[PDB]
Design a protein around this ligand. Structure first.
Ligand SMILES: CCCCCCCCCCCCCCCCCC(=O)OC[C@H](COP(=O)([O-])OCC(O)COP(=O)([O-])OC[C@@H](COC(=O)CCCCCCCCCCCCCCCCC)OC(=O)CCCCCCCCCCCCCCCCC)OC(=O)CCCCCCCCCCCCCCCCC
Ligand SMILES: CCCCCCCCCCCCCCCCCC(=O)OC[C@H](COP(=O)([O-])OCC(O)COP(=O)([O-])OC[C@@H](COC(=O)CCCCCCCCCCCCCCCCC)OC(=O)CCCCCCCCCCCCCCCCC)OC(=O)CCCCCCCCCCCCCCCCC
Ligand SMILES: CCCCCCCCCCCCCCCCCC(=O)O[C@@H](COC(=O)CCCCCCCCCCCCCCC)COP(=O)(O)OCC[N+](C)(C)C
Ligand SMILES: CCCCCCCCCCCCCCCCCCCC(=O)O[C@H](COC(=O)CCCCCCCCCCCCCC)COP(=O)(O)OCCN
Ligand SMILES: CCCCCCCCCCCCCCCCCCCC(=O)O[C@H](COC(=O)CCCCCCCCCCCCCC)COP(=O)(O)OCCN
Ligand SMILES: CCCCCCCCCCCCCCCCCCCC(=O)O[C@H](COC(=O)CCCCCCCCCCCCCC)COP(=O)(O)OCCN
Ligand SMILES: CCCCCCCCCCCCCCCCCCCC(=O)O[C@H](COC(=O)CCCCCCCCCCCCCC)COP(=O)(O)OCCN
Ligand SMILES: CCCCCCCCCCCCCCCCCC(=O)OC[C@H](COP(=O)(O)O)OC(=O)CCCCCCCCCCCCCCCCC
Ligand SMILES: CCCCCCCCCCCCCCCCCC(=O)OC[C@H](COP(=O)(O)O)OC(=O)CCCCCCCCCCCCCCCCC
Ligand SMILES: COC1=C(OC)C(=O)C(C/C=C(\C)CC/C=C(\C)CC/C=C(\C)CC/C=C(\C)CCC=C(C)C)=C(C)C1=O
Lengths: 387, 286, 134, 54, 76, 65, 64, 105, 104, 157
């Protein structure tokens, strides 16, 4: 009986109808597609199950779709969402491989498609490098899956070959020293895909890790590499895109410290606060709120980034992971300097914000002003909330 | 015994290719109210042999600006693939024989593209891509036709296959439009009329050129045998001759398409028709 | 290939079976059912014949050196090649369906597969990508 | 030249077809030797545990 | 995922099912603690898979056969 | 499914958490088990077969001479 | 026309004689007129068992 | 000590291991173009596909064949997209680079 | 060791109709034993009984109707064990040797 | 079994040869030889249909796209530092260590395995693809859809 699979049939039927509707709308010469975007958001809601993580991903992708305008980009983001959703439910390396590869192909094509102006060739260059680096990591995953399949005779993810699969997962999160594909991507690709790349796949992969993964090894050297390299790199790079790429490497090192000491509640709290800050960061038009992102990414006390860092520090001290904790505290002391550089650049400066001329007047002030109210979330964060 | 069987197969293939190219000349002449080759031997029966021997003592032109290995390799690859496809027709018992021959005929594209890469002509590079585009475009309709054919091929034990000895010995009346599409696809693969616009062997002389034409006529005979197996209830000598006569008859009476015209035909007419027929036959076969 | 174990020889003992297998004639109704071995021999023999065709006019033909005898006398292909690649993969997927005696849920799964195929194809048709004007 | 390249390819193919099976044979011989050492050590441990384990 | 290539199931599927049944019937709060009590079924499943111990026995018999022909070449 | 799993909470609490791979394989492919035959039955059946051979209602072990 | 008849007759005769000769040769190799049939795993197992038992019958014949 | 089947199996596994590392390393080591890098990625995929098919025959199991079909699909899609991007980048940067498709120079 | 074998595959196909109508109890016992016990040692008497019951039947046919059985088995051998190509030989053999003992 | 083992070992030689040569055309020719030889290797394992899929997809379809791209984009620069710059000794050392000596093999502690031919059943494959792995089949279709749309969007205008 197939009566337990109506959501899958609904997914496929919705894709079949959406392609035909997008074709009919384009035969009329419509230069805007807000109706297509609303149908895409409805389809996103209709295929998502009733778990916390699934709906967090769903609501995140509904918010992200407001920064994309063409039909093909919307289709690629939907088919990347299918991989992102179904990776959280993957209990093998077969589905794991297919979901990861679908996401990689969608990201590569979007990086090629959306570039404009003088930065087109730089974006295509960085997309090619990302594709080549992704191909060999995919080959490593397939090779060691074949080794595990031959040794165990089954699809269980146990044994020594899980160390290389773990390295595949660490590549997909931009963990140093395999971090330079993300550093290349941050310097050229436009802001909407940078917003997409810093939020949704990290959530999808960490939920797969929380749900169906065990390894008998450690990730401590990659924690050290990510934290020290990210902090020193963001201290040393004057371009703002490289600053935010290296600060992202530092944040993924903190999330790996939360993974390594168990306690995924602190991981989920810090990831949620980080995702809301990212949603504020890449949609800013008034540059004074760039200082709020700075004080809430430096871990300064009353804002929500402090709470996200401080439960990670608390659980690390609870299980006595002293050396990694000391390295994390040193890199936190270093991170403050370049977040202060951000504050010097964009707060202690005269205010200029250009008006719109061709309509759409400051079109994402709702989301940015809503996400700035991360100064009111700390009242709920101090309680036993995320567990 | 396998080497003996293969050589005993190879002999009538080459003899038949010589007689096909003579019969094409003479039938094309009879439609045009003339005679065709009659002087060269009694009833002209030595003309292909003297063409082959004339090309044998002809000077081989090796251009000293090309890559000699790929230039030599292109007609060898074409000829070898034609002979191997004939062996797959007659000296095989494989379960997926039609898939084997489809795979071999998909390899035949390489001789055209190696000739296009090797010779340093401006329009050989221009025409090889067009010929490859035509063959590539009609291979998909051939594959979907094979999908429609294989839905009804079952052996005695109940297993579905593409084995030629398990095909029925009666004409497939239910698949007449698919048979017509298959025949026009054969015409498109062999670059005959009305798809003969693209040539690629403009720099070849003597026995490399002879290898090109032997490969072309042998591939035509392969596709004729395949169509007679799939649709006409078996492989026979009379069916080979009748289908060859039909191809020459079409070449006598029709003009050719432009490049974009047969591209639109193959990508907007033949592929949707073969896929729709596959869906209908799958609905019937349940 | 010859069998290397008593279990592979149906537990027949002796030395007559080993020599008889190593010096056997090829037989589709003996030990070599569905074998694909004549395809390799055909390649070797036809390569020999075409090499003899290549080499022979270098001996029995006239030749004259001249500097003029040794001289020369779009994105749609990208579309065709990539579309042919994807459609060939799809037909290869459809082939295990046609080789089975499929039940009704198999039929509806296959039709969902074909529907996704033809939906992408019809989108590229409607946007004017199969009109080969350029 | 063409004859030089065909000769070099034929030489490389024949040399690869004769040389690599010796590498594989040496590797398999090393694995057999280490496995036999492991078997003997396991038998020694079993005898020791039977001796002081009753 | 345990379906056979030419048969209904794989050739060592039932050994795997024996091991998983043993793991199912234990009550320890950790998988690593439950694994210590089902090591015999895991060993039999690994012996189904790769036959390392049968190969080891044949290697030992071959070592003795090569020893009884070099050190012992007794003529009649 | 063969590569995906979905987890939902029992409203009543009367469901036992097991390995979903083991449960999936039990429902999909089953599990075959066997037993060793008791030796007394083996010698009894061997004696009966020997008696059937001797009394003449059983043939030989080969069709040849 | 009458000039096109001899080549068309010769093609048929060539293919008839060649197929007859190839049939006789492969019939001598295989000794049964169903060698080209499709065979599944059960039929392959049956043929391989038959071949090995024929070899065993030959081995046992040269001992009496 | 070992049989002909064991030689055949160990030779297969040694061959595929050297194939995998050849595809991973060699075109980068010889400082080749992006087109040859994509070809070597196809070599990596072929090594994994051969390993899966060998294991599927070895265990009498279906999962290797499923993985084989999936690997062919994903590898061809990624290769086609990469070649399209290579052509676009070459046409964007050939006016000032000449050797634009070689990033290992 | 003793040589144990059953007739050739075309002979087995030619005699397969008599096996269930004349050696049903050996067939039942062999099927039940292989269902219960996996080790080949544990099902040796029933295996031996089924082999001997097949060989005794093969000895019966060659005493009563050898030429009809030989031509039918040769026909099955020639056409790749396809029953649909040897209906006349099958009818002649079953007429010479009935599947069940008629007029009893 | 000399020719079968030699045909198995030839695949690694062709894998090295793809990157070793300086001509891109010759690299593609080596790859075509490798895929044909590997399709014949897969048929030693008993796979008839999947070897034909290997041939039909990789040699028939993908290598044609490779040869079109190479023939459209490669003006001869083999002298232009493709010969004059050589190769990387560190990369060659990595290849030797990992693929010749094989310090981290896929079989791990095991060193000997018995190769066993299979018997491919396409009825089993059809049942598996269209009943047991149907969700993976549909997601493969979605990946092919991504490829088709993405190529047609990325085609240089
Ligand atoms: C069955 C499922 C039904 C559909 C559900 C998913 C689709 C949601 C899409 C949506 O709300 O479309 C916005 C759309 C407004 O877009 P618009 O006015 O055409 O665009 C103006 C500009 O965007 C400029 O205007 P703006 O940026 O100020 O407003 C943008 C928009 C939404 O702007 C945002 O994306 C920012 C809002 C942040 C709140 C996020 C909530 C998540 C909280 C998590 C709690 C758990 O504004 C709203 O807040 C509208 C909310 C209406 C109800 C939503 C339910 O809302 C509607 O028209 C109503 C949609 C509700 C269902 C019909
Ligand atoms: C689907 C496609 C269609 C194919 C299917 C059709 C069915 C088969 C029909 C047969 C084909 C008919 C025509 C054959 C061509 C005749 C030769 C010719 O005209 O010159 C070639 C000619 C040589 O190039 P060139 O124009 O002189 O130079 C231009 C380059 O820029 C120059 O490049 P380069 O200088 O960089 O390359 C030099 C290279 C030149 O390579 C060649 O000469 C071509 C190689 C393949 C051609 C095979 C034809 C016969 C060659 C002799 C084979 C002997 C092998 C052993 C046989 C036993 C004899 C004792 O020679 C070498 O030095 C090789 C070095 C070896 C690798 C080194 C790396 C590893 C080092 C590690 C340690 C070393 C140990 O061009 C080609 O390679 C054309 C490719 C087309 C060949 C057919 C493709 C398929 C082959 C059969 C299937 C594969 C199955 C595997 C079985 C055995 C392997 C073959
Ligand atoms: C690669 C270089 C060529 C290798 C050639 C080779 O291996 O030769 C083979 C295959 O080559 C040949 O036999 C053909 C030689 C080609 C040249 C013949 C020209 C035409 C006359 C030998 O075949 P035999 O072992 O004698 O045949 C085995 C028995 N059976 C007939 C059943 C296959
Ligand atoms: C107002 C915001 C601005 C508007 C824009 C909206 C932006 C889009 C939507 C937000 C995107 C960020 C969300 C990130 C994911 C966080 C939630 C992951 C789930 C999680 O933490 O675990 C569950 C706790 O849920 C919880 O209750 C977690 C609490 C919330 C965490 C986030 C903290 C920052 C706010 C426990 O799961 P369980 O025990 O039920 O699971 C057992 C069955 N598998
Ligand atoms: C670093 C941050 C602190 C900065 C000043 C550190 C000064 C050195 C500590 C002196 C402690 C006194 C002392 O020697 O007693 C020790 C008590 O052990 C202990 O308990 C050692 C605790 C000392 C470190 C506590 C500081 C932690 C602050 C937070 C760090 C960040 C997170 C953790 C990595 C061992 O006595 P002995 O060996 O001399 O006795 C000799 C006879 N046996
Ligand atoms: C297997 C069978 C394969 C059949 C292939 C069918 C190809 C359909 C492509 C049709 C594109 C042509 C086109 O513009 O179609 C429009 C709508 O057609 C459609 O929307 C037809 C969709 C059919 C889906 C199947 C016609 O209407 P329009 O939008 O041009 O008219 C208002 C603007 N003038
Ligand atoms: C000195 C050392 C030389 C080493 C050469 C190694 C590579 C060998 C390449 C083929 C050599 C041909 C002659 C060798 C004999 C042969 O066929 O060997 C077979 C091994 O398969 C193979 O060798 C498979 C390779 C086949 C590649 C040829 C590709 C043809 C392309 C044409 C398109 C085909 C389309 C698909 C059907 C098995 O021989 P056996 O033991 O069974 O023989 C005797 C029992 N009868
Ligand atoms: C200030 C911060 C306000 C954030 C609001 C937190 C609300 C959490 C509700 C969770 C719940 O009741 O579960 C519903 C439900 C689970 O209960 P069920 O209805 O029984 O399945 O899951 C969800 O829908 C989760 C919603 C997650 C929203 C994104 C994560 C936070 C942003
Ligand atoms: C034409 C456009 C493409 C059509 C195919 C696209 C979708 C592929 C088919 C998915 C089929 C899902 C199950 C269908 C089913 O069980 O129907 C039997 C079912 C049996 O009839 P009953 O007696 O009402 O149960 O048929 C129907 O009632 C539905 C008719 C078929 C419609 C298929 C497409 C559905 C959306 C439109
Ligand atoms: C309008 O279409 C046509 C063309 O344009 C496409 C042509 O170009 C040609 C001319 C080209 C020809 C005939 C070349 C192709 C055929 C060949 C080489 C014949 C092959 C025959 C063989 C191998 C058998 C002959 C050899 C024998 C008998 C061996 C002899 C040995 C001894 C005596 C010892 C023709 C006739 C034609 O109609």
């Amino acid at each position: 009986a197939a009566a337990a699979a109506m959501i899958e049939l609904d997914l496929c039927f919705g894709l079949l109808l959406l392609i035909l509707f997008g074709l009919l709308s384009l035969r009329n010469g419509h230069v805007s597609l807000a109706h297509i975007r609303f149908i895409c958001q409805c389809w996103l809601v209709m295929i998502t199950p009733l778990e916390v993580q699934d709906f967090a991903l769903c609501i995140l992708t509904v918010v992200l779709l407001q920064s994309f305008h063409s039909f093909e980009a919307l289709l690629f983001l939907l088919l990347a969402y299918i991989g992102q959703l179904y990776m959280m439910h993957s209990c093998n390396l077969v589905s794991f491989y297919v979901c990861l590869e679908a996401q990689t192909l969608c990201v590569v094509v979007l990086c090629g498609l959306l570039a404009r102006g003088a930065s087109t060739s730089f974006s295509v260059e960085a997309a090619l490098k990302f594709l080549l680096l992704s191909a060999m990591v995919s080959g490593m995953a397939l090779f060691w899956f074949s080794a595990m399949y031959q040794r165990t005779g089954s699809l269980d993810m146990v044994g020594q070959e899980t160390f290389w699969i773990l390295l595949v997962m660490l590549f997909k999160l931009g963990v140093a020293p395999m971090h330079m594909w993300s550093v290349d991507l941050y310097g050229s690709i436009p802001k909407s895909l940078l917003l997409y790349l810093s939020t949704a796949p990290k959530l999808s992969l960490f939920t797969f890790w929380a749900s169906s993964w065990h390894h008998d090894f450690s990730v401590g050297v990659f924690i050290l590499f990510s934290m020290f390299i990210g902090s020193i790199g963001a201290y040393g790079q004057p371009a703002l895109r490289s600053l935010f790429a290296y600060s992202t490497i530092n944040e993924i090192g903190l999330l790996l410290l939360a993974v390594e000491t168990a306690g995924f509640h602190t991981l989920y709290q810090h990831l949620g606060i980080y995702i809301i800050t990212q949603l504020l960061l890449w949609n800013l038009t008034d540059k004074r709120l760039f200082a709020l992102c700075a004080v809430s990414l430096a871990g300064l006390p009353p804002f929500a980034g402090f709470f996200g860092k401080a439960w990670i520090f608390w659980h690390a001290m609870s299980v006595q992971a002293f050396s990694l904790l000391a390295a994390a505290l040193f890199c936190t002391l270093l991170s403050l300097v370049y977040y202060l550089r951000v504050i010097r650049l964009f707060w202690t400066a005269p205010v200029h914000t250009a008006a719109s001329f061709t309509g759409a007047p400051n079109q994402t002030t709702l989301t940015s002003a809503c996400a700035v109210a991360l100064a009111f979330a700390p009242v709920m964060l101090v309680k036993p909330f995320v567990i | 015994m396998i080497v003996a069987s293969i050589l005993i197969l190879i002999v009538p293939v080459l003899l038949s290719v010589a007689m096909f190219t003579l019969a094409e000349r003479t039938v094309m002449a009879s439609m045009q109210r003339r005679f065709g080759p009659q002087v060269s031997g009694i009833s002209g029966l030595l003309q292909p042999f003297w063409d082959g021997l004339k090309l044998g003592v002809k000077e081989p032109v090796l251009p000293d600006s090309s890559s000699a290995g790929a230039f030599a390799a292109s007609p060898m690859i074409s000829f070898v693939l034609s002979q191997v496809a004939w062996v797959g027709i007659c000296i095989s018992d494989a379960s997926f024989q039609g898939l084997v021959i489809m795979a071999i005929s998909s390899l035949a594209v390489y001789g055209v593209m190696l000739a296009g890469w090797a010779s340093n002509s401006k329009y050989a590079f221009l025409g090889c891509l067009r010929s490859v585009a035509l063959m590539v475009s009609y291979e998909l309709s051939l594959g979907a036709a094979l999908l429609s054919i294989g839905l009804f091929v079952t052996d005695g034990t109940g297993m579905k296959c593409l084995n030629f000895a398990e095909m029925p010995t009666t004409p497939q009346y239910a698949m007449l439009p698919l048979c017509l599409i298959f025949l026009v696809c054969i015409l498109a693969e062999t670059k005959r009329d009305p798809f003969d616009l693209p040539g690629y062997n403009v720099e070849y002389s003597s026995l490399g050129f002879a290898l090109f034409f032997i490969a072309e006529y042998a591939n035509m005979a392969v596709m004729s045998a395949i169509a007679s197996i799939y649709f006409l209830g078996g492989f026979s000598a009379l069916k080979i001759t009748a289908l060859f006569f039909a191809f020459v008859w079409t070449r006598g009476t029709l003009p050719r398409y432009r490049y974009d015209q047969f591209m639109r035909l193959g990508w907007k007419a033949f592929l949707p028709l073969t896929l729709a027929f596959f869906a209908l036959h799958a609905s019937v076969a349940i | 290939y010859n069998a290397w174990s008593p279990a592979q020889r149906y537990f027949v003992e002796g030395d007559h079976v080993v020599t008889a297998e190593a010096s056997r004639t090829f037989q589709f109704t003996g030990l070599d059912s569905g074998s694909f071995y004549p395809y390799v021999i055909a390649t070797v023999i036809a390569t020999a014949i075409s090499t003899v065709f290549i080499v022979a006019p270098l001996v029995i033909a006239p030749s004259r050196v001249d500097l003029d005898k040794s001289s020369a006398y779009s994105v749609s292909f990208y579309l065709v090649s990539i579309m042919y690649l994807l459609f060939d993969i799809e037909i290869a997927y459809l082939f295990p369906y046609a080789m089975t005696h499929a039940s009704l849920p198999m039929y509806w799964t296959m039709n969902l597969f074909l529907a996704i195929l033809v939906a992408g194809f019809a989108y590229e048709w409607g946007m004017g990508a199969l009109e080969w004007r350029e | 030249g063409l004859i030089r390249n065909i000769a070099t390819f034929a030489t490389a193919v024949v040399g690869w077809s004769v040389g690599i099976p010796f590498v594989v044979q040496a590797r398999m011989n090393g694995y057999v030797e280490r496995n036999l050492a492991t078997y003997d050590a396991a038998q020694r441990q079993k005898a020791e545990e039977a001796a002081i384990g009753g | 995922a345990g379906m056979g290539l030419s048969t209904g199931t794989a050739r060592c599927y039932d050994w795997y099912m024996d091991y998983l049944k043993c793991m199912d019937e234990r009550k320890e709060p950790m998988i690593a603690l439950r694994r210590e009590h089902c090591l015999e079924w895991l060993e039999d499943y690994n012996e189904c898979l790769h036959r390392e111990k049968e190969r080891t026995r044949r290697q030992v018999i071959e070592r003795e056969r090569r020893a009884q022909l070099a050190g012992g070449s007794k003529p009649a | 499914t063969a590569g995906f799993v979905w987890r939902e909470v029992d409203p009543t609490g009367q469901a036992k958490n097991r390995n979903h791979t083991y449960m999936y394989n039990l429902k999909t492919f089953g599990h075959r088990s066997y037993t060793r035959r008791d030796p007394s039955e083996l010698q009894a059946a061997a004696t009966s077969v020997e008696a059937r051979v001797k009394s003449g209602e059983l043939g030989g072990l080969s069709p040849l001479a | 026309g009458w000039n096109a008849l001899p080549s068309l007759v010769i093609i048929t005769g060539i293919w008839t004689a060649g197929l007859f000769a190839l049939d006789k040769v492969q019939m001598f190799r295989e000794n049964k007129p169903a060698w080209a049939n499709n065979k599944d795993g059960w039929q392959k197992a049956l043929y391989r068992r038959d071949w090995y038992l024929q070899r065993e019958e030959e081995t046992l014949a040269m001992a009496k | 000590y070992y049989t002909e089947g064991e030689i055949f199996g160990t030779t297969f596994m040694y061959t595929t291991n050297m194939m995998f590392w050849a595809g991973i390393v060699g075109a980068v080591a010889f400082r080749r173009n992006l087109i040859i890098l994509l070809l070597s990625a196809e070599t990596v995929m072929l090594a994994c596909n051969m390993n899966f098919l060998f294991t599927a025959a070895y265990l009498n199991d279906i999962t290797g064949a499923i993985m084989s079909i999936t690997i062919t699909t994903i590898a061809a899609c990624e290769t086609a997209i990469g070649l399209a991007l290579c052509v676009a980048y070459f046409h964007m940067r050939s006016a000032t680079d000449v050797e634009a498709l070689n990033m290992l120079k | 060791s003793n040589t144990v074998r059953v007739p050739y595959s075309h002979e087995l196909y030619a005699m397969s109709r008599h096996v269930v109508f004349r050696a049903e109890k050996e067939h039942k016992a062999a099927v039940e034993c292989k269902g219960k016990h996996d080790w080949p040692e544990d099902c040796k008497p029933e295996s031996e009984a089924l082999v001997r019951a097949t060989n005794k039947l093969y000895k019966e046919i060659m005493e009563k109707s050898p030429e009809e059985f030989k031509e039918y088995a040769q026909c099955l051998d020639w056409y790749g064990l396809r029953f649909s190509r040897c209906r006349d030989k099958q009818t002649a053999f079953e007429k010479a040797f009935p599947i069940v003992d008629a007029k009893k | 079994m000399f020719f079968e083992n030699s045909a198995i070992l030839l695949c690694a030689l062709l894998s090295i040869a793809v990157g070793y040569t300086k001509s891109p055309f010759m690299s593609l020719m080596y790859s075509v030889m490798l895929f044909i030889n590997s399709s014949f290797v897969l048929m030693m394992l008993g796979f008839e249909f999947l070897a034909l899929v290997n041939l039909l997809v990789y040699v028939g379809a993908l290598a044609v796209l490779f040869l079109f791209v190479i023939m459209l984009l490669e003006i001869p620069a083999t002298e232009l530092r493709a010969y004059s710059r050589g190769w990387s000794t560190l990369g060659i050392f990595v290849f030797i260590i990992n693929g010749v000596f094989q310090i981290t093999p896929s079989m791990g502690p095991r060193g000997i395995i018995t190769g066993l031919p299979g018997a491919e059943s396409i009825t089993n494959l059809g049942h598996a693809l269209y009943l047991y792995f149907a969700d993976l089949l549909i997601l493969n279709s979605l990946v092919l859809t991504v490829a088709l749309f993405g190529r047609f969007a990325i085609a240089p205008v």
